[PDB]
Amino acid sequence: LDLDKFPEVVRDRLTQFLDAQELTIADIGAPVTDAVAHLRSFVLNGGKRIRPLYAWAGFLAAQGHKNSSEKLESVLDAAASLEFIQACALIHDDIIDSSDTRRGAPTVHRAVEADHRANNFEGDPEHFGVSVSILAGDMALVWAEDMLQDSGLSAEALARTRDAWRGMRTEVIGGQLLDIYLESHANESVELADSVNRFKTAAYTIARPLHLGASIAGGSPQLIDALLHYGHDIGIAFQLRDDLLGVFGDPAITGKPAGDDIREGKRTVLLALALQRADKQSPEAATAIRAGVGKVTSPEDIAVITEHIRATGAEEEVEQRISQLTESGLAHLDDVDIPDEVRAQLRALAIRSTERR
Amino acid sequence: LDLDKFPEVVRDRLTQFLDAQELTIADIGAPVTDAVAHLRSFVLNGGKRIRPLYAWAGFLAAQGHKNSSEKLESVLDAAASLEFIQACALIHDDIIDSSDTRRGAPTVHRAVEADHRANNFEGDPEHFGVSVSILAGDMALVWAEDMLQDSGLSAEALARTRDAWRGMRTEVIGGQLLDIYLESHANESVELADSVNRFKTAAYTIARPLHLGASIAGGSPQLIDALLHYGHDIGIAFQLRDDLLGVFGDPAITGKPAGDDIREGKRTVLLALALQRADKQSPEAATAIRAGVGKVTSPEDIAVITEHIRATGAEEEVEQRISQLTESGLAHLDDVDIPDEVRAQLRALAIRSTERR
Numbered sequence A, B: 001l002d003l004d005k006f007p008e009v010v011r012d013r014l015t016q017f018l019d020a021q022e023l024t025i026a027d028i029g030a031p032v033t034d035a036v037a038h039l040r041s042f043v044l045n046g047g048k049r050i051r052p053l054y055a056w057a058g059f060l061a062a063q064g065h066k067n068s069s070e071k072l073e074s075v076l077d078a079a080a081s082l083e084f085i086q087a088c089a090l091i092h093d094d095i096i097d098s099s100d101t102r103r104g105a106p107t108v109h110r111a112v113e114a115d116h117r118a119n120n121f122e123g124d125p126e127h128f129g130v131s132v133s134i135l136a137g138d139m140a141l142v143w144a145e146d147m148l149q150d151s152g153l154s155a156e157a158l159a160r161t162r163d164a165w166r167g168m169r170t171e172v173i174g175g176q177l178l179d180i181y182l183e184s185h186a187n188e189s190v191e192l193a194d195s196v197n198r199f200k201t202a203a204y205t206i207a208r209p210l211h212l213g214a215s216i217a218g219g220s221p222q223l224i225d226a227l228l229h230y231g232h233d234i235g236i237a238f239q240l241r242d243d244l245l246g247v248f249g250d251p252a253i254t255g256k257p258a259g260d261d262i263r264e265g266k267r268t269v270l271l272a273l274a275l276q277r278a279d280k281q282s283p284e285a286a287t288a289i290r291a292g293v294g295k296v297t298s299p300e301d302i303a304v305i306t307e308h309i310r311a312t313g314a315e316e317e318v319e320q321r322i323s324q325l326t327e328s329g330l331a332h333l334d335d336v337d338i339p340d341e342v343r344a345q346l347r348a349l350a351i352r353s354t355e356r357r
């Protein structure tokens, strides 16, 4: 019903689920409670809840509030379950990218490491933090599936979810695998970074949540097609925006420290275009960027690389692509009959995702 | 139908599933194919397939071959899906315990690390191996769920699987969390190590596979109870046997190098009893064991710790517990009507699991 009120509903569904696990986790033991509490806080103090939002929009675009005989609570739990996949993805991503900060706060492995300092116990706290976090992510992923399966959605509705759900989870992990193979090979092709955006972000963040929601409502293939097309375009633009924010955005907007993508050495489309341009502009600048990415750590060294990147003209090219993709994404909403209210919310979601931060 | 022929059927179901993923993985890109190939080999050159075996036995104990109108292929895929959970568990366990060898061959993270030496590319190969393996495990876990959900089991059968399936996956990850919290706190209580055996092994390896199989067949609560009781006892004994093998077993039997549990410093019931005994016997020996576990690496230093452990009398106490649990586990098969052939196979499975290696 509302873009700003929906995340609170998501938090309620999640709190309910986490509470329901407490006795089983307790029966295993108090240290598992301590581990799950770190997952609980990471999940409950979440981001914008963009993925459940899109699932809910997809449900409403397919006219679920009028036609669907699924229980409301069941649909909301299915939408909210995506936050557990997100938890898995982010916790594991942060180990892989070895980041210290997520959402303005310490990453789960960093936070578990700081619990081992207060205990003064046996073993390396850094490896222990990583260890607990691998398992915390596994638990989150297992709980995503449970939250969907035990939602109370009918057997018919659950069977309809398969295409979106099967698609999404392979696509996100596949995209994350492609990402780190680009980081290891120091890759500079735009087209391979494009594939990462398509699978690791677009499918997972926008296209498949919409598909999932529409499928729960029993949406027609024509409705689903338009939503998937919207999700592809807006989803890629969303990632391109986050790439720009990961370099040029204030820490208050991103959660991370300024230019953390340079620290991590992420192989964005921005970087690929920047290196491509700097090879034809200033060999000294290209070399400066190449030596910097994935190595430098001081604020001053990040800023120098960043200004070299900006001086290529790459940022403007990314901005143009964002604008083009936002425009074509929005246009797909006019290809089918969608209720006025939902179309308006889908438009504002897109604009907020790609342009308005 | 057969204990020795069933693992080949499992391999066939798995090969079929993995082949079916190839186009989706290819659409993402060639490096994801390379990553999945490492998971494919790890899964296809598997162990004894004990978990699908027990699921199949549970199905047959509930008289599925006579009464069930589920497709045979669907039941076998559900049984085989447990190998993907195992893959997830083992790949992630090997990162956490930092082991180099699994099943006589290099661990997935060690093998991915050796692929980065042949490429001579950017970044630390050790962290990259761990990185790919975290995601390889995530993919395995996601594929376990898919293989079950898309098995072709009816909506009725899938709804019946929930208790075993929900139970198992929380219990295994929970048990793995409790395990590393015992390793970090250098814990020496028998009762906390018991809980790890109960949840990380018994539930996951024997009790819940049996429950899953019986549930697919629509087994009565009385049949399921007897199988769960058998699974509890035999499952704990199975872990206790593997603890003894992890110290006193030949590498040809275990896959790992001799006494790798001492290298890893695993907090087994054997070690807890050994330290408890050595405190009342020889303070020098207790201290020798305490300084050794999780630290020493040379064959000679492992053997010294091992002989100190054996000299406590702890091994004999574990052997007695194994024998007691095997006897009470087998007895539970007589508490309900189970077909003669299946009861005989359940007996031989138990004996092979706890005594006969």
Ligand code: DMA
Binding pocket: A046, A047, A048, A049, A050, A086, A103, A200, A201, A205, A239, A242
């Ligand atoms: C690029 C990418 C997938 C970022 C994570 O998404 P998000 O910004 O929605 O994260 P959060 O859950 O913190 O809102």
Ligand code: DMA
Binding pocket: A089, A090, A093, A097, A172, A176, A200, A201, A246
């Ligand atoms: C699945 C997923 C998108 C994880 C985030 O990857 P990332 O490192 O690209 O995003 P972030 O910069 O938010 O860590």
Ligand code: DMA
Binding pocket: B046, B047, B048, B049, B050, B086, B103, B200, B201, B205, B239, B242
């Ligand atoms: C203690 C424990 C759970 C060991 C792994 O089980 P397993 O011996 O069945 O492994 P594999 O899959 O190699 O047969």
Ligand code: DMA
Binding pocket: B089, B090, B093, B097, B172, B176, B200, B201, B246
């Ligand atoms: C889920 C599970 C049992 C993983 C194996 O743990 P472990 O380290 O006790 O077994 P292994 O000795 O086979 O690594």
Ligand SMILES: [Mg+2]
Binding pocket: A093, A094, A097, A099
């Ligand atoms: Mg990251």
Ligand SMILES: [Mg+2]
Binding pocket: A093, A097, A179
């Ligand atoms: Mg990343």
Ligand SMILES: [Mg+2]
Binding pocket: B093, B094, B097, B099
């Ligand atoms: Mg291990």
Ligand SMILES: [Mg+2]
Binding pocket: B093, B097, B179
């Ligand atoms: Mg272990």
